[PDB]
Every structure is written in C-alpha cells, then in structure tokens.
C-alpha cells in the first residue's frame, strides 16, 4: 500500500529501503546545507547504479549516469549551470526523483532538471549519499523520504 | 505533469496552491518542533487544513493534546462541522521521531490517507469531494505543538 519511509544518510554511507522504489514511486533528498563532491545514488539489488547524480561544482555541471554492477560508466547526460537549478532557495535544497518506468524525472527544488531515459531498469532497493564522508555542497546528513506503493 | 511545489506556511496563515492537489496527489507538512504537552492550558491550536476553492474544508486535521486525540473532519463553506473521525493516543502516532514531525496526506479519490511520519493513522473517507486549491496550518498566532512555521511540499500531476 501507499506508504512513507524516512531515512537519514550521512555522507559516505548507504541505506537499504524498507519499501522498494519502483514505477510510480518517488524519493526526495533533503539537504540542510547548500554551499556551491556530492553524489546521490539509487541502487538495484544486484548492486547496479540505477541512477547516479553527481553535482560538479568545479565544472559547474550536474552529471547523470548509470552503471552495471561489474561494468563501467555508461552514457552520461549533463545539465549546465549548477547554481541555476537551486535558484530560488538559499542555505538548503531538495532533490526529488520520480521513477516513471521508462525514465527517471529529476527535480531540484521545484525545477525539473532532466527526464533521464533509463540505461538500466529494475527496482531501487537501496540508496546512498556520498560526499566522500567529507560533505561538500550539502549537509553531512541527508534525509530521504520515499513515497512507495503509488501505482 | 508531475511536479514538486514548496510552501512556507506560518501559524495563522494560508497559501493558495500553484498546482492543485487532486486524486493521486500528495502533500506533506514538516514541523521543526514537536511539543505534545498541554504547555499552557489549551491543547487545541495545532491544525492542518486542505481547502476547496469554494472555501470548503476538504480535510481538517486537529491535534488535541489535552484530550489526547487526533481529530479528522470536513465542513461545507456555509455549514457546520460534519461527522468527526478520531484517533486516540496522539503521542504514540509520532512515536519514533522526537523534536520534529511529518504529516502526509494522500488524495485517493474517495478518501484521504493520513500518515504521521511513517505510520498511517487513518483512511478518512471523504465527506466532501473536490480538488485542494489551498492549505493552511493553524496554531492561530501561537506555537502549539509544531514549529510556528510549517514547510509544505506537494507532489502533483501523478495520476
């Protein structure tokens, strides 16, 4: 049934989802810091990177990509100008990802930044937030709320 | 299309939704404070509301600390409160999270599902239908049990 699950993920760690994120489900990451490194990931149970999100502060670009458990990085999609996507909110931020089945729609705050057509499919059984335990643009701890069982 | 909208609602105010909330949509209220004790002598302030454009109270949520119960009810723009639904033991619904809280409302069409943090507390069958065009959070000036400012995030265009 439709449900809400709360998680706390400190940089450099991951969490196993009590309720998997599948088609029709949503997951939102909340940062209590926003100083513009940091990557948000959705994992398949076999260890595949369903969706990799890397905010490149030096290049000032947001990267999106997938990866097989024993394969390398695949075709990446990029969005230009990091600061622009978070434009509208200072000192904090949120990243939302909708699993639409054929693709993942990524939203930063209220702005949709990309309709990422999947390179790898499956259900998200875990998530992680690396900032390499160093924490960069986001707070050292990200709160992840998921809304599952929507379909 | 599927979107996300963020609102900042102070106690005693309301906001009109940029994107209405209808069947299949979700709204979540985040509180920075969680004091569930009658810290004065009037544990009735804490209320969350989903409004219909005609002013109807689609869903009225009232956290009653003194009686120690959570009430759910609706009301026509020109009528009185209707058939009240209640959930006893307020504090036990927020069990698992201290110093904060989350209240989520799912619009399923014929009902409203309310979840406090991770626990579903009621499948409230609608007494009034329609789409949510505005929301309000009352502590009517005062603080009540939640932070004097509630953040509201809506997920719309889901259907």
């Amino acid at each position: 049934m439709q449900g809400v699950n709360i998680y706390n993920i400190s940089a450099g760690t991951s969490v196993d989802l009590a309720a998997p994120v599948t088609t029709g489900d949503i997951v939102t990451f909340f940062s209590s810091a926003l100083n513009l490194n940091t990557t948000l990931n959705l994992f398949a149970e076999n260890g595949a990177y369903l969706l990799h999100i890397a905010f490149r502060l030096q290049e000032n670009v947001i990267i999106f990509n997938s990866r097989q458990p024993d394969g390398p990085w695949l075709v990446e999609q990029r969005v230009s100008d990091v600061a622009n996507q978070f434009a509208g909110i200072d000192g904090k931020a949120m990243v939302t990802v909708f699993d639409h089945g054929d693709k993942y729609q990524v939203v930063i705050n209220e702005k949709t930044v990309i309709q990422y057509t999947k390179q790898i499919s499956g259900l998200t059984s875990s998530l992680s937030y690396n900032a390499t335990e160093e924490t960069s643009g986001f707070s050292t701890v990200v709160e992840a709320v998921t809304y599952t069982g929507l379909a």
Side-chain angles (χ1 to χ4, degrees), chain A residues 7-86:
Chain A
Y7 304 88
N8 301 98
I9 319 165
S10 50
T13 83
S14 72
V15 187
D16 280 7
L17 301 185
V21 163
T22 198
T23 304
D25 298 345
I26 314 171
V27 61
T28 297
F29 299 97
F30 290 97
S31 186
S32 55
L34 191 261
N35 183 50
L36 313 171
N37 279 297
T38 172
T39 63
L40 299 176
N41 307 295
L42 283 65
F43 290 90
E45 192 173 4
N46 60 12
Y49 274 89
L50 258 34
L51 177 64
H52 177 68
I53 309 180
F55 300 83
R56 302 311 194 74
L57 309 178
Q58 74 299 300
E59 277 183 60
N60 191 40
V61 59
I62 310 178
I63 274 60
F64 303 75
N65 213 322
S66 304
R67 177 170 180 288
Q68 291 304 359
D70 276 318
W73 288 103
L74 312 178
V75 198
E76 69 170 52
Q77 306 303 319
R78 35 173 53 214
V79 171
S80 287
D81 202 319
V82 178
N84 288 173
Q85 321 311 154
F86 300 83

